[PDB]
Every structure is written in structure tokens, then in C-alpha cells.
């Protein structure tokens, strides 16, 4: 057994934290990069997701 | 515990153990780690 979770978006609002910068948001003015997670691009044997 | 069939190295000495299978790790730390020496042998044929 290894066991893979796949659905939520935490309704946090506790643990804001971080590692990267102002290098970054997406292209224009306002800053929502707040996507939580939808389902999964994943690989296979030897080259291929 | 006693010594009838228990091998040695080559000047007086009894043994205790085993293992079993095939191909890629034992002769796989020669292209990596171990050593080599010499030219003798002995053990009963009864």
C-alpha cells in the first residue's frame, strides 16, 4: 500500500505559506493564483503521461 | 554443536551457513567492491 488523495479544496484559511516570489503571478494586473486541485495528468512507463 | 561436516579456509577450521539463486549482484560488486587471492582446497568425501 501507498494511498492517493484526489478531491478537495480545503476551505482553509490557516497556513498561508510559501516558496516563490514576484518573479511570478500570471500576465496582467490582479493576483489570483488560487487553484486547488481537479484530477491528474500522470505518466506511464517510458516517456508518456 | 560439533564438527563433522563444517568446512574451513586452509589450516584447521569448522563452518555454519548458506544462501541460493542467480546473476546480477554477486558477480555485482566486482565490477564494484570485493577482493581475490589463492590456490588450495579440501573437504571429506564421506
Amino acid at each position: 500500500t501507498f494511498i492517493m488523495p484526489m478531491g478537495v479544496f480545503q476551505a482553509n484559511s490557516m497556513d498561508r505559506y510559501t516558496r516563490h516570489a514576484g518573479d511570478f503571478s500570471t500576465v496582467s494586473e490582479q493576483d489570483p493564483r488560487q487553484f486547488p486541485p481537479q484530477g491528474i495528468f500522470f505518466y506511464n512507463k517510458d516517456g508518456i503521461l | 554443536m560439533v564438527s563433522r561436516i563444517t568446512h574451513t579456509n586452509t589450516r584447521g577450521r569448522q563452518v555454519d551457513g548458506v544462501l541460493v539463486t542467480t546473476a546480477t549482484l554477486k558477480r555485482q560488486l566486482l565490477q564494484g567492491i570485493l577482493q581475490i587471492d589463492d590456490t588450495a582446497a579440501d573437504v571429506p568425501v564421506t
Binding site: 512507463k45 517510458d46 516517456g47 | 565490477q31
Partner: protein, 49 residues
């Protein structure tokens, strides 16, 4: 061998040919690996009469 065994006996063929392609000019700086697959090459063909 069955569908899986055939299947990536096949696919390991794919990886190996993608990796061990130009071993003498890729891994030229490691003399150790050269003798590491040469002994494999000689000890992979069956002898004759």
C-alpha cells in the same frame, strides 16, 4: 511469455535502446562502465559446439 511479459519486455527494449545507444561516445569518461557492459555482451550469447 504472455501479454504483459511481452508488453514491456517490449517496453524495456524501448528504454534500453533509448539509453544504451551510443555508450562508447556517451559514457567515455567512465572506464568502469565500459567493462561493465562488455562482460554483459560476452556473457549473453550462448556458446557453440
Amino acid at each position: 511469455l504472455n501479454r504483459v511479459a511481452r508488453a514491456a519486455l517490449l517496453s524495456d527494449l524501448k528504454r534500453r535502446v533509448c539509453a544504451d545507444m551510443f555508450f562508447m561516445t556517451r559514457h567515455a569518461r567512465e572506464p568502469r562502465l565500459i567493462s561493465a557492459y562488455l562482460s554483459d555482451m560476452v556473457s549473453c550469447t550462448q556458446p557453440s559446439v
